[PDB]
Design a protein around this ligand. Structure first.
Ligand SMILES: CCCCCC#Cc1cn([C@@H]2O[C@H](CO)[C@@H](O)[C@H](O)[C@H]2O)c(=O)[nH]c1=O
Ligand SMILES: CCCCCC#Cc1cn([C@@H]2O[C@H](CO)[C@@H](O)[C@H](O)[C@H]2O)c(=O)[nH]c1=O
Lengths: 810, 810
């Protein structure tokens, strides 16, 4: 059909068809009269997977012959989403399969919709991981993602009476044709026990053994025939485990619970033992795989020239004392040498500065669960603190601040401090977040070792986040400037010479209008809800968090509503405000925010005076595959976190790429986005980071805003009095109370300037042609935000390897 | 190589080879340089499974077009063993695959050894089930096996210091290429709740839901292109299950524990709740499958003309009140009509008369777990007892004996009584066991309904139990009389005209000697143990049980040993005595017996005076695949249960088929075996059933035998004094105590005649040529004992359907 989707040749189409039929019959054991859409999706999936394997084998073979330096990306999260379309796209099979399946009388799109998301992640962190593996493959890096194969991913969100209900995401119910179980590289992981000292060093003994079985899933590069591996571990009990008899067998579940469910907090940190076991599990099994792969090439000097380990936040920070444990206790290197190898291997990416988000493990936990690692960590601390004393003699306060060990009611190990100490590079995820790191929470560590601190502004993959979810926009871009930009997204700049081209202007706007028409229909079919597709589409999608200030959005919505009820016969640009996201299950406030949003919907959406001028939709079960649908359909992107809190953000990037304009604060990557497009082409409002500080020193008194803004006073009055909850008039007193007395995020301080800026958005939207020209300026400058750029920067400046864009043979 | 293994044509061989290579690459994602034997076994397995599926689909299609009456075989046990070779054999692919794999430079036999047993059974009962499914397919019956897909089967038995250790049989570790998950026919099963009465009848409510997911495994008939289905259910939790959040997800294991492990008792009955849930699970999910399949053909009159349900013992007896529940409560038939349908559908096979083996469920259990079924059972009882009163007025004792409900400290439901009441046929499993049923435990029920009681002597499948495990013997048979006998085993009779044929005599003996030479080697390679292959091979293999009187064997062994130490320079026919079997984990005595056997081994096997004249081996991990090896290699078969206790036995049949002579008592099928071969061709000793009764009425006093047999007194003295346990001299006091004061099985009563008869075995063995001629008479008369005969008898006399030997098209 459209050109970026590859060739539908007569060979390939005829061949796809017979392989589809072979799978349907031999693999699925069905015939065309009993097959359901789910069987059809499978046959297609097995058929496409057939095109990977040849390439997959040759890629692993290549890395053996060539023995390049290897990148190991350790993450507890890999938010993959669906695999089928991505695979076709990267393999140039999209038009072929589409043709083949059409001729068999099937609609491919209907089949794509049957695939479960692999929701092995909560949000931006696990999805960074996913974009990174795609980019690593595309750039021919010899990279492996390592994580955990959770039996249940992020929960599916149902709304009942406007409250979030969580249900189990049983994504493996029907099988996963993408993975390959490799029970033959099963590895032991040890827990508990005790440390014994001998003539010949420490020995960790009387431990419980849990086996780690790996599953491999192919990661295909973009049209370069590189296929890398994501290896996820699964917990299995040993056969002599516990081994009255029945219970012994039934208790095998106790071990395998390790990889059973993904922790769904991204706000808070809970010191729960299961979580720590998960972190150790992945790190222990991964290091033996890394070490084994290295030995098949006594001398660990070369280890750092052959291995790079990137730590996605501090979740796999135990890699550091685990690498010492192996080197010192099992391979018998002296401390000082093993330490040099360790620091030179490991690097650390921090994803937040929120204090409640940082891992601080109780010592009593590490002591029972991992007693030798505790010894190592203490020995690490001591030697570290002697470096500090030597560099800053007399400074005893610096000593207590920098310690890996927090003194207090319960002793804690600060896992960030460990990562900084044991890594040669530490990075933030956007320029401003990186400066904040050096100026505030890691300032002490920066003065000791300024050379460790870097920046690597996040990016997203334009294969998933443009070609895949937005084929129409990819096409019109390709018509003008070619296809090269799909893996060199800087070329999008060439679009700046089309900014006064009437034919492009109509085409950009035409595509936006289609994506809206299509999403508007998805809203009716799957969820019986009625939207005007000529309205502006105002979307905030991301996890629910106080810092992300969905509440601020709510306040705007309520204000537009109140202005409309005040002058009903005045013209306002209509809007459909969509807000969607999951709340972590114990985060009471977050859950109240979801409730408020639906409450506003019940009032606003059924007011006959409002008409179709304002609609408020909460988007159920936001996740990767819903993001691929709503992002191409959006006009306004809401990125409105209090300055200084959102480390980078990546949703913001997906929207810029797809023709939405951004309303946001100068926070995280928003800053570089505006810098790249010009501030004129951006809707910036609110305090900068400096303003927030000034406010913290005076003290933030919310009353002041309430006393001076009548429009705001009215909203609080409505919330307090029961306007939005006529059955429970006091339903929202917690929010009204938080807003008024302990808002760490200064919702009221930004309200005035946020509303004024929202008025400027409506004004520009009334002039279609200038709206679109601004869109063009955004899309045209979104190049920097490709995860290809990001990965090339890690590669060159942290891992010490060259990206290569060259094909491998077919 | 040999003719019964089919054609190795040039088409098939070349085609096997490329499919093997396709699977190795596409399915297993390996290449010839990294492949391990396990990968090779898989590729072969997937290649052979490819030849089933076409046939499998056409068989299920046929049954739809033709709509014949359907047999549902309900069992908690299916002891399948390995599937690969059986599949090749039934499909005529053995010589082809052997050729193909040879040309790829592989040894097929080495590959066959890598396959796990599906040990979804304990012993004869679950293996009857397996032989029956093979025979049902071979006879073109539209039959389905239904059971449970246990995650762990019968435990693997290790010996440590001569004690049994149990470890978990994790038979699914590496995948099972034979099954097909069919998540789309998932079915709800309900538990707990309570019964509510309405205007419109009872309603079972507030129940917990457990889902049953079916797995299908192909059951290929012998060279007729019929492939039937074994459907095994797997327990899965629902997604809103329990649905702080973490525990909710972790507690999903509580539901799925249902299908987690197979109960390994075959002696005793434990009223454990998990077991009852297993029995209900299988019965509830199976009945909806049966009912659904029936509706796709309001009127249940035809139900019994379209459905037959065979109950393998009382384990799935809840099928009966479950069928009433559905008919009465969900489809709204009146009692009397639903009852007629039920009795006409169901039949019951009893497998034992041992009182501790019978299921008697506590009422408090059924009341909490299945409260409506309890109501039904009471209503069944009442109506049943009114039939009894009417037929035997005044007989109040008969009323208490016949009741489904046992009065007592805790009320129990007698599940046998339920099966008899709710079934149109009840059968024993050998002629003598069937008479015992009618004369003793079911006598009351027989006088009420003599027409319900039948016999169906057990059988075994000659495909697995001859062609497969003994290709050499199958060949020489085929040389003389053709191949037709493989599915018409009566033709083995034609061998009686070769009894004086010198060339056959040498060939029969030649094969026996090979199987011995080969097993003798298997003993060294896998278990470092040293046997003389010219000795007589004396084997007792079967579960360890007091009734099966392994102890009696021990006493003989010890006696041969003591006679040898008394006259060391006298000639005795050498023997290798092998005894093997698992003990149920809580059966303390059984476990002591294993211990004794190894103790005898430690003394006997290291006496230099004994030489290689006597060896005593305990065979570790006896199971289906070890049976396929040791049975062809045996000379003497030990079937020595106290008369009246072994309902039928089937090991006895496997040995007759494979050229061993039998030493045994007149118990179970032994009786019909001797009747078929002539008593002269059999080594019969000991009490008949009548003798046992006479002894029970006088009282069995073991002292008497001890006082009159010096050879016996000496053995007891040795056991008591520590001769076999020099470190723990009192190790065996429990056995010596049981033997002397409470042996329900009269080991001493049979000892004298058992030894005399063992002397007659040794005498005949010294004359090779007459030994073999007797073997010929056994093998030649083993026809009756084919499970094809058995199934044809169920078919004609219980199920009301005709066996058909006709091919279906290819
Ligand atoms: C000391 C160890 C404790 C770590 C606690 C944490 C954290 C997280 C950060 N981010 C986002 O990660 C994204 C990817 O970098 C960012 O764009 C976004 O700004 C982040 O909030 C998440 O999405 N989830 C998180 O849990
Ligand atoms: C009231 C319900 C309770 C049932 C309890 C039971 C039983 C069993 C019978 N048999 C054998 O089943 C075999 C197959 O019929 C026989 O040949 C052999 O003689 C039997 O002992 C077994 O092998 N295992 C058993 O558990």
């Amino acid at each position: 059909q459209i050109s970026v989707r590859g060739l539908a040749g007569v060979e390939n189409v005829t061949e796809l068809k017979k392989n589809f039929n072979r799978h349907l019959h031999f693999t699925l054991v069905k015939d065309r009269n009993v097959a359901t859409p789910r069987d059809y999706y499978f046959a297609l999936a097995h058929t496409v997977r057939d095109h990977l394997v040849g390439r997959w084998i040759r890629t692993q073979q290549h890395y053996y012959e060539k023995d390049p330096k290897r990148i190991y990306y350790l993450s507890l999260e890999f938010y993959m989403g669906r695999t089928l379309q991505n695979t076709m796209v990267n393999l140039a099979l999209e038009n072929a399969c589409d043709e083949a399946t059409y001729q068999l009388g099937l609609d491919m799109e209907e089949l794509e919709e049957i695939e479960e998301d692999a929701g092995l992640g909560n949000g931006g962190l696990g999805r960074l991981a996913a974009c990174f593996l795609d980019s690593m493959a595309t750039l021919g890096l010899a990279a492996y993602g390592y994580g955990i194969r959770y039996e249940f991913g992020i929960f599916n969100q149902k709304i009942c009476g406007g409250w979030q209900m969580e249900e189990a995401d049983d994504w493996l119910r029907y099988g996963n044709p993408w993975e390959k179980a490799r029970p033959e590289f099963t590895l032991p992981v040890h827990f508990y026990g005790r440390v014994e000292h001998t003539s010949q060093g420490a020995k960790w003994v009387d431990t419980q053994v849990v086996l780690a079985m790996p599953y491999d899933t192919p990661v295909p590069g973009y049209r370069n025939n590189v296929v890398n591996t994501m290896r996820l571990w699964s917990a299995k009990a040993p056969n002599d485990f516990n081994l009255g008899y029945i219970q012994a067998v039934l208790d095998r579940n106790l071990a395998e619970n390790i990889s059973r469910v993904l922790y769904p907090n991204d706000n808070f940190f809970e010191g729960k033992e299961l979580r720590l076991k998960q972190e150790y599990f992945v790190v222990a099994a991964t290091l033996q795989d890394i070490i084994r792969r290295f030995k098949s090439s006594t001398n660990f000097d070369a280890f750092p020239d052959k291995v790079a380990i990137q730590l996605n936040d501090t979740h796999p920070s135990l890699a550091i004392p685990e690498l010492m444990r192996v080197l010192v206790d099992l391979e018998r290197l002296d401390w000082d040498k093993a330490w040099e190898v360790t620091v030179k291997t490991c690097a650390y990416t921090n994803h937040t500065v929120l204090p409640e988000a940082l891992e601080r493990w109780p010592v009593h936990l590490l002591e029972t669960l991992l007693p030798r690692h505790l010894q190592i960590i203490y020995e690490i601390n001591q030697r570290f603190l002697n470096r500090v004393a030597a560099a800053f003699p007399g400074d005893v306060d610096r000593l207590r601040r920098m310690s890996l060990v927090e003194e207090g009611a319960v002793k804690r190990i600060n896992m960030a401090h460990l990562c900084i100490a044991g890594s040669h590079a530490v990075n933030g995820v956007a320029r401003i977040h990186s400066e904040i790191l050096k100026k505030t929470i890691f300032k002490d560590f920066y003065e000791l070792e300024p050379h460790k601190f870097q920046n690597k502004t996040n990016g997203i993959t334009p294969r998933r986040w443009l070609v895949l979810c937005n084929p129409g926009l990819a096409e019109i871009i390709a018509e003008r400037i070619g296809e090269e930009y799909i893996s060199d997204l800087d070329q999008l700049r060439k679009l700046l010479s089309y900014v006064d081209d009437e034919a492009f202007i109509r085409d950009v706007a035409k595509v936006k209008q289609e994506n809206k028409l299509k999403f508007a229909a998805y809203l009716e079919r799957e969820y019986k809800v009625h939207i005007n597709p000529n309205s502006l589409f105002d979307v905030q999608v991301k996890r629910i968090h106080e810092y992300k200030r969905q509440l601020l959005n709510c306040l705007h919505v309520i204000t537009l509503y109140n202005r409309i009820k005040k002058e009903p016969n005045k013209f306002v640009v209509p809007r459909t405000v969509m807000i969607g996201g999951k709340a972590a299950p114990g985060y009471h406030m977050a859950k109240m925010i979801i409730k408020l949003i639906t409450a506003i919907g019940d009032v606003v959406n059924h007011d006959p005076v409002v008409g179709d001028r304002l609609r408020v939709i909460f988007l159920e079960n936001y996740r990767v595959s819903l993001a691929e649908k709503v992002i191409p359909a959006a006009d306004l992107s809401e990125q409105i976190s209090t300055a200084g809190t959102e480390a980078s953000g990546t949703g913001n990037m997906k929207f810029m790429l797809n023709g939405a304009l951004t309303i946001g604060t100068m926070d995280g990557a928003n800053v570089e986005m505006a810098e790249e497009a010009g501030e004129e082409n951006f809707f910036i409002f609110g305090m900068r980071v400096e303003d927030v500080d000034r406010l913290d020193q005076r003290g933030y008194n919310a009353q002041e805003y309430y006393d001076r803004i009548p429009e705001l006073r009215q909203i609080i009055e409505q919330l307090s009095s029961g306007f939005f909850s006529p059955k429970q008039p006091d339903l929202f007193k917690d929010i009204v109370n938080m807003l008024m007395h302990h808002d760490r995020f200064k919702v009221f301080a930004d309200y005035e300037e946020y509303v004024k800026c929202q008025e400027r958005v409506s004004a520009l939207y009334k002039n279609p042609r200038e709206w679109t020209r601004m869109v063009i300026r955004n899309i045209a400058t979104s190049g920097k935000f490709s995860s290809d750029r990001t990965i090339a920067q890690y590669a060159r400046e942290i891992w010490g390897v060259e990206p290569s864009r060259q094909r491998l043979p077919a």
